[model samples]
Target chain A: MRRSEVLAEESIVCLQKALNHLREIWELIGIPEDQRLQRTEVVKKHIKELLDMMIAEEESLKERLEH
Target chain B: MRRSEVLAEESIVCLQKALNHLREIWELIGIPEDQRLQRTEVVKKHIKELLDMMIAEEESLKERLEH
Candidate 1:
């Protein structure tokens, strides 16, 4: 695979590992139901922001690469 | 360069490269594992979700981009 392909795969793997870690934490803590719900929502928001950043970065790279 | 500018530049570049190819995934795949964990527990969750979305998007984009 090309360097880019390697990097992309690694990125996905890293992300998956992180998510798994977070879930593990939640399982250990056993947060209260309400708190858990609230926390989950907050996680969703951060994830959205991250995704937005990722998309933006992808677009920027595409432009740069095209040029 | 200003710190924020440098960071932003790097961030964009890193994300771009990672998305371009899966192999060089370290470009932006995992949050600063330690720093990410420090986020308000709630915020941390959202960030995780955002990352999840990104991973998902990348997968979707991969197929599209492939064709």
Candidate 2:
């Protein structure tokens, strides 16, 4: 459970860095404005899914700890 | 040079994931819309600074390889 907590936090940190890097690369690669927005939505969905899983996992751990 | 290119690419990938995680966390943590936007601009500045360094390094490596 402690490991999961560490992992959740680490995952968030890793995801944040990756997202910022992608933003920079998008400009460097000269992606069109329209395409960029579209791609972002797709990426957001993926992030959301991952976030939900982490949140659920955290909550489950909390409950187990309480018990 | 090859290692630098790989690093640059990896940095981009890492940043992309991080940014997305931040976005998700913002909503989860109930951060106000205004504050979220403001923080984003600040984060972007940091990311830009990093990105410039990576890009410049890549260019320098390319030049070295040419000679």
Candidate 3:
């Protein structure tokens, strides 16, 4: 794969990993239910948005590279 | 900044750095203008969308953390 493709794809994986890690935090942490729900929701929303972003770039960059 | 804030800020920096690197590729590689225009625009659009994603999340998280 070209460097652009390489970078973009790598970013996607990294972002997804971060997203999952954030999810795992919700599962592993011992915060109270209401607080956990609020805090984790915010974290998840952020990471999820980030994942969407990485996917967008990955798709666009892939087309650009035509790879 | 809290850890979440730190992480989110760090990611924004990383993404912007990667974006600038992508631009440098165009200048350094010297692909044809038409092709360059097309690919770079797509890449830029993706990055901009991602930046917006980061900003939105950052603001939301900042509020949650109240930090």
On TM-score, the candidate that comes out on top is 2
Interface RMSD per candidate: 16.3, 12.3, 10.3
Model with the higher DockQ, candidate 2 or 3: 3
* lDDT head-to-head 1 vs 3, winner: 3
C-alpha lDDT of candidate 3 relative to the true structure:
0.46
Assess each model's interface with DockQ, reporting 2 decimals per model: 0.07, 0.05, 0.07
Q: Arrange candidates by DockQ, highest first: which order?
A: 1, 3, 2
Candidates' C-alpha lDDT: 0.41, 0.46, 0.46
The lDDT-based order of candidates, best leading, equals 3, 2, 1
Q: How well docked is model 2, in DockQ terms?
A: 0.05
In terms of TM-score, which candidate is stronger, 1 or 2?
Answer: 2
Candidate 2 per-residue lDDT over residues B1-67, each given as its tens digit: 1212343334435445554555555545543556545444544444454445446534653454554
Please give each candidate's TM-score.
0.30, 0.34, 0.29
Runs with alpha carbons beyond 4 Å of true place in candidate 3: A1-67, B1-3, B32-67
In CAPRI terms, model 2 is classed as incorrect
> lDDT by residue for model 3 over B1-67, one digit each (tens)?
1234344444544554555555455464444556544543454445444445445444554455564
Model 3 CA lDDT for position A36:
34
Q: What is the C-alpha RMSD of each candidate to the true structure, in Å?
A: 17.8, 12.6, 10.5
The residue pairs found clashing in candidate 3 are none
State the TM-score for model 3. Answer: 0.29
Interface RMSD of 1: 16.3
Q: Which stretches of candidate 1 lie over 4 Å from their true place?
A: A1-32, B1-67
